[PDB]
Amino acid sequence: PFLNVFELERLLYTGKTACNHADEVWPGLYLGDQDMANNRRELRRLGITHVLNASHSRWRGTPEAYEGLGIRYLGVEAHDSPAFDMSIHFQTAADFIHRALSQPGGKILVHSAVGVSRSATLVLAYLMLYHHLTLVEAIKKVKDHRGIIPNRGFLRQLLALDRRLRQG
Amino acid sequence: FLNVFELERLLYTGKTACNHADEVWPGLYLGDQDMANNRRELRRLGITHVLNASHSRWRGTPEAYEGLGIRYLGVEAHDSPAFDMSIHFQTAADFIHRALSQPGGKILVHSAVGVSRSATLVLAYLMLYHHLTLVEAIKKVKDHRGIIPNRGFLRQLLALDRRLRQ
């Protein structure tokens, strides 16, 4: 009927972290939630050219408005569970983000359902691979602008990426 | 360097709170030092009591509070897992209770950053006066303000929870 401080901590980490539906966390890189992904007017207003859905649903498929908005789309199916292997998506998502930003005027929304875990993981991987931030560095840069908390398993995967990169 | 558990605390403690204070319970605002110094906001919100869980004894009661009629209790706590907040649980929950028992009463419980020292007394108040368990108190508050008491305060609230629930 009682717990230890570690389980309390895990519960506390499910508290409020997100303040807006999306935040620019890197020049031209917005990180946000499903609402922003479905907000045609805001996607219009912000000049969104690429969308990376890190929570792609085979049921809902590619949002129908993105064609009318000129949006290049990449959905990856992913589940926000410490047991899920998000690393299968690191390089394909990073490359996508790189070529979105590489384009003059390019602007990308990376999103999940909440915008704090699946999506945040791929952004942090993108900064590690393409800008050579440490895992801790990328976390500090992103959390300056959006309260992120990748699940424990995604953090363990990002730590392993951090290890492998810093060696080579 | 940093293990995953350290990465978690860095992410969740080092985020930027959406607001300088949040109503986490009816008439109970939990927030930071900025809000404590925000005369405009204090008046707009109708704050009638302030509990400074980060009180320094060489500053007194904030001077502006008397003219506003704001009643003050300062708790001289440090945000350290070695600091025993438990000796203040009751005196703090009492003050909060009197504030909220007053018609129109509204309290600001604050600390430096509004995540640990102040949050700890808010949780203790909810357990003592509304008989919530620690976990219930946390679920009540966490979606309004992303609190995270330091591990030692969590241990002292676990001690309280067990005592109150025999």
SS3 of A9-50 = HHHHCCCCCCCCCEEEEECCEEEECHHHHCCHHHHHHCCCCE
The closest of A34, A25, A29 to A54, measured between CA atoms, is: A34
The two tokens of residue B29 are: 């605002």
Hey, what amino acid is at B164? Answer: L
Contact B4 A155 (CB under 8 A): yes
Nearest Cβ partner for A16 among B2, B18, B165: B18
Residues 6+ apart with CB under 8 A from A167: none
Beta strands in chain A (DSSP E): 22-26, 29-32, 50-53, 72-75, 108-111
Q: For residue B143, give the 3-state DSSP assignment.
A: coil
Contact A17 B14 (CB under 8 A): no
Using an 8 Å CB-CB cutoff, list chain B residues near A114: none
Q: Searching chain A, which residue's CA lies closest to the CA of residue B142?
A: A15
Q: Which of B1, B6, B7, B166 has the highest number of chain A CBs within 10 A, making it the mutation to test binding with A?
A: B7
Separation of CA A35 from chain center: 14
Q: What share of chain B is helix, strand, coil (3-state, %, to 5)?
A: 45, 15, 40
| PDB resolution in Å | 2.0
Q: Give the count of beta carbons closer than 10 Å to the beta carbon of residue A79.
A: 11
The rounded Cα B127 to chain-centroid distance in angstroms is 13
Element (H, E) at B109: strand B107-110
Q: How many residues does chain B have?
A: 166
Chain A residues with CB under 8 Å of B18 CB are: 16, 18-19, 147
- B11, B138, B141: residue with CB nearest A148: B11
In the numeric block, which tokens belong to residue B90? 């009751």
CB nearest B162 (choices: A2, A8, A149): A2
CA pair distance B47, B39, nearest whole angstrom? 10
Instruction: Please name the helix (run of DSSP H) or strand (run of DSSP E) that holds residue A129, with its range, or none.
Output: helix A118-131
DSSP-derived letter for residue B51 is E
Q: What's the token pair of residue A97?
A: 């983000």
Taking an 8 Å Cβ-Cβ cutoff, which residues of chain A contact chain B? 1-5, 8-9, 11-19, 135-136, 139-140, 143-144, 147-150, 152, 155-156, 159
Q: Domains in chain A, please, with CATH?
A: 1-168 (3.90.190.10)
User: Residue B45: how many CA atoms within 13 Å on its side-chain side?
Assistant: 25
Tell me which amino acid residue B21 is.
A
Q: How far is A57 from chain B (nearest CA, A)?
A: 26
Of B4, B146, B147, the CB nearest to A152: B4
CB neighbour class for B126 (10 Å; exposed up to 12, middle 13-18, buried from 19): buried
> Nearest 10 degrees: CA dihedral of A65, A142, A133, A99?
10
* CA distance linking residue B109 with residue A71, whole number of Å: 47
CA dihedral B122, B124, B130, B131 (to 10 degrees): 150
Determination technique for this entry: X-ray
Q: How far is it, in rounded angstroms, from Cα A92 to Cα A111?
A: 15
3-state secondary structure of B38: coil
Of A5, A14, A139, the CB nearest to B155: A5
Write out the H or E segment, with its range, that includes residue B22: strand B21-25
What is the C-alpha to C-alpha distance for residues A65 and A70, in angstroms, rounded to an integer? 9
Strands B107-110 and B49-52: parallel
Interatomic CA distance for residues B137 and B160, integer angstroms: 12
